[PDB]
């Protein structure tokens, strides 16, 4: 998982 990708639902 890219750390900058969407961390939300």
């Amino acid at each position: 998982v890219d750390p900058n990708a969407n961390p939300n639902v």
């Epitope: 998982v1 890219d2 750390p3 900058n4 990708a5 969407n6 961390p7 939300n8 639902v9």
Partner: antibody, heavy 125, light 107 residues
Framework: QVQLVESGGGVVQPGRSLRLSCAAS????????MHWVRQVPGKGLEWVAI????????YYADSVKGRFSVSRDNSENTLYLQMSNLRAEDTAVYYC??????????????????WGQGTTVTVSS | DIQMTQSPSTLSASVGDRVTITCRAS??????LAWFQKKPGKAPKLLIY???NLESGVPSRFSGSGSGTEFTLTISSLQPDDFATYYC????????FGQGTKVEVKR
């Protein structure tokens, strides 16, 4: 009324541990990724850690990796930062920051939007 | 390993002056750049997201532009509330901030 309130800041001796908390209100804490950002005296703002909305993914900055642990409790709307093996360089104001949240969340790479007022952690013997 | 540089470090200006502060990235970050405002003793507030898009409630006098390595934050008419420090932040590869730019009162 998105509000993030930090707590647990204070004095901690080097090599010891301290846990910070962040109370979240005004939004759905369970639906948002959260960040920890710190500002060491003199030095500029530096990102510490990020945790996913479900707690499944966590990433850390190299300076705190292996000593710092980010956690969350979505049933209590609280974010956590466990700091261990603390050093004087870890003395800073720590901010609880919300990841960017939009209803039309069609973005590829996400940053931060709302910060908390922050809490001070003083590491000294 | 993305460094953010801001010029100038301290900007002297007056009320009503058009103010422009520049932010440079060590590599191309496309438009994944954000501008924050921090007044002393207060928490940073996000003004501009995706390099140019203004955030909700942010006054229309604030403006941002750029794509790649060079970015700017422009205040067309400087107001008293606008005297503070501004940070740029990239969110492509982790999150790094610029050293900050203080807008002081010219005298």
């Amino acid at each position: 009324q998105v509000q993030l309130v930090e707590s647990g800041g204070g004095v901690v001796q080097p090599g010891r541990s301290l846990r910070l908390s962040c109370a979240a209100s005004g939004f759905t804490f369970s639906n948002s990724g959260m960040h920890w950002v710190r500002q060491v005296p003199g030095k500029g703002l530096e990102w510490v850690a990020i945790i996913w909305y479900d707690g499944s993914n966590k990433y850390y900055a190299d300076s705190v990796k292996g000593r710092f642990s980010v956690s969350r409790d979505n049933s209590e709307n609280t974010l956590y930062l466990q700091m261990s093996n603390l050093r004087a360089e870890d003395t800073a104001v720590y901010y609880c920051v919300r990841a960017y949240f939009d209803s039309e969340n069609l973005y590829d790479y996400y940053g931060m939007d709302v910060w908390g007022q922050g809490t001070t952690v003083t590491v000294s013997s | 390993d993305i460094q953010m540089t801001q010029s100038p470090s301290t900007l002297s200006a007056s009320v009503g002056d058009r103010v422009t502060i520049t932010c440079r990235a060590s590599q191309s970050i496309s438009r994944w750049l954000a501008w924050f405002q921090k007044k002393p003793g207060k928490a940073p507030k996000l003004l501009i997201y995706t390099a140019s898009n203004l955030e909700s409630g942010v006054p229309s006098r604030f403006s941002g532009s750029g794509s790649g390595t060079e970015f700017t934050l422009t205040i067309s008419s400087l107001q008293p509330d606008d005297f503070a420090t501004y940070y740029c932040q990239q969110y492509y590869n982790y999150w790094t901030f610029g050293q900050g730019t203080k807008v002081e009162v010219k005298r």
